[PDB]
Write a protein that binds this ligand. Sequence first.
Ligand SMILES: NC(=O)c1ccc[n+]([C@@H]2O[C@H](COP(=O)([O-])OP(=O)(O)OC[C@H]3O[C@@H](n4cnc5c(N)ncnc54)[C@H](OP(=O)(O)O)[C@@H]3O)[C@@H](O)[C@H]2O)c1
Ligand SMILES: NC(=O)c1ccc[n+]([C@@H]2O[C@H](COP(=O)([O-])OP(=O)(O)OC[C@H]3O[C@@H](n4cnc5c(N)ncnc54)[C@H](OP(=O)(O)O)[C@@H]3O)[C@@H](O)[C@H]2O)c1
Lengths: 319, 317
Amino acid sequence: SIPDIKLSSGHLMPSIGFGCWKLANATAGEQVYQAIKAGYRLFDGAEDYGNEKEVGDGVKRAIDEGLVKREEIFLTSKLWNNYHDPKNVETALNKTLADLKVDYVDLFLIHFPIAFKFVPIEEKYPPGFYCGDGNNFVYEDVPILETWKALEKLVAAGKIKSIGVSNFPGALLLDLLRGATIKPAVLQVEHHPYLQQPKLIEFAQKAGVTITAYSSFGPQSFVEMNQGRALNTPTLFAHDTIKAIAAKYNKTPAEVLLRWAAQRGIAVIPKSNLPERLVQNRSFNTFDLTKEDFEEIAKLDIGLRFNDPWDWDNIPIFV
Amino acid sequence: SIPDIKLSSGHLMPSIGFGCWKLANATAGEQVYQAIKAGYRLFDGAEDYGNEKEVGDGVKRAIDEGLVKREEIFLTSKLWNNYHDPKNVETALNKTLADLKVDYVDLFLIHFPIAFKFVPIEEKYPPGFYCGDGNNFVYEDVPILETWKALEKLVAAGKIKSIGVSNFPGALLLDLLRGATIKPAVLQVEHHPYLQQPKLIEFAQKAGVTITAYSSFGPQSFVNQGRALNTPTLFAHDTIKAIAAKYNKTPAEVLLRWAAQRGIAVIPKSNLPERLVQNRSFNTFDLTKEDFEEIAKLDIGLRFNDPWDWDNIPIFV
Ligand SMILES: NC(=O)c1ccc[n+]([C@@H]2O[C@H](COP(=O)([O-])OP(=O)(O)OC[C@H]3O[C@@H](n4cnc5c(N)ncnc54)[C@H](OP(=O)(O)O)[C@@H]3O)[C@@H](O)[C@H]2O)c1
Ligand SMILES: NC(=O)c1ccc[n+]([C@@H]2O[C@H](COP(=O)([O-])OP(=O)(O)OC[C@H]3O[C@@H](n4cnc5c(N)ncnc54)[C@H](OP(=O)(O)O)[C@@H]3O)[C@@H](O)[C@H]2O)c1
């Protein structure tokens, strides 16, 4: 049912996966397991999510029960900001591998083109915004390419199958493509009708980089974090454009939001604590948005970004 | 008169300069010379402008006539897109030096974070968008930092006083800063009330990078581009007029002052002598917080110089 996408690395990646951000440690293992039973095969995690051990527990349970074999699960993780210095990259990957209880991750991404000062794992993990000095942000002078070469070596050592990046704007991705020996296979970015960045999508896809969309439901994911920008934003779920299209096909607004990306070759990783939403978030490929529908949804693009490092410490990633 | 700005390199840079883009070759020498007599000391040029030889004649004439000495003139040039590969960087710079008839340039900027396939100087100069294969754009795998290191080397060789970048978005500048031994001293970007990019300015200034604004008059500079032609003029914008008529200054003087008062260098260019004068003496009034607030409302992120138009190059996306 779930179409696979061919990555530039020579490996297949499910076009629909299960998001793990803000999956409570207490119920994550069980929800990952239920997701596998519901047919999900790709799991989008990260060291920063702090629940990789639980994600691993869920996968290991499914494997121990004979529902799936390791090779049938696509595990994505992300290298956090404090670990860009080459000498720390493998250490961070090792922690991820140990927590996930596996020998390799299918996809490992540079979480952000941001290098926080290294913080020893036994000092605090996941470190979040901690940089070794109270609440102050401290950075390291590690160019992206240095981190990328450390990742390329880990691919050669068999610990990572495919490598890619997240939160990279066009000029940065373009430059990485110039110095990379193993081209980044995936660009994972915030993508929803309020932030469509059509030119980025076009450039990346023309360059052979697969797009994975995150926060496909826009502000939704951020309101529980009490983010003001998101709370002030009208939901996509109650938006007249999305609702009119959903009604026309007799689909849910969530299905239209996910299909709007899937139909354009963009991979999705919807997240949900609700069992009822598992099947739904993975079975939306039952109708086709017309040229007209796309023109209508295109009108909602306003460049509204919910995940912006500028908010953390005026980091100029998207400026 | 014209305030100087101390660059992160230690060297000083006039805050008001004379732009050389489109200065016709037949009269560029004379215009640069007249500009020097008019008080200008910084000349913003580029290999791509194709008139460095003539800009050089102008400066050489002012020096031979004893109006100025080489070290009182600040020359800026820019490394064009076909010369990013380190093995070609010095070739391009040597051509700029031979053309300007100088032993070094004061500021050498990476013109665009774009690497076109190398085309020999002898094959075509300036190459412009020609990449050695008909009208097709062809690129080279040369990371920004490799080009930068070649420039740092040319600084140690004494051929360049300060180095910097142009048309670099925030993320790219941030990354270059992590790898630079000599920090880029300047960030030259399009900057006007319709494209204010305040967060980029704030980040750059805070990192110690000096901003040089170009196209200070917005749409007035690309007018045969449709985008610019179909954009309401800033010279007739109600907010600009209001502030200009409120200080008895021209709209042009308000547009330049808005940048200058914020520590941003400007490089206006006028074929007309009167304006030539106007453009170097607009620091005769201050904008109030309220003025800035009203001007800041014009920001719509409208960009006239976008590589996306050339070949869907993702520099600003
Ligand atoms: N690399 C990065 O920077 C980055 C940043 C953010 C996210 N990501 C990744 O991408 C994933 C997805 O993004 P996200 O978690 O931010 O947000 P999302 O998937 O857009 O989140 C959807 C929000 O909508 C609700 N929801 C889920 N299915 C729904 C449905 N069918 N109908 C109505 N509401 C529904 C969920 O609530 P319930 O849980 O109560 O169902 C959740 O609060 C993450 O889990 C993570 O793996 C990566
Ligand atoms: N790095 C880059 O990518 C880049 C890109 C573009 C430009 N630049 C540099 O920055 C400079 C700025 O570009 P530009 O020359 O097109 O922009 P500009 O100097 O802002 O152009 C102003 C236009 O307005 C007119 N003008 C000048 N002064 C005036 C005044 N006081 N009152 C009314 N009209 C006035 C001029 O025509 P008249 O001559 O008839 O008065 C000129 O056509 C260039 O020369 C170049 O050195 C760099």
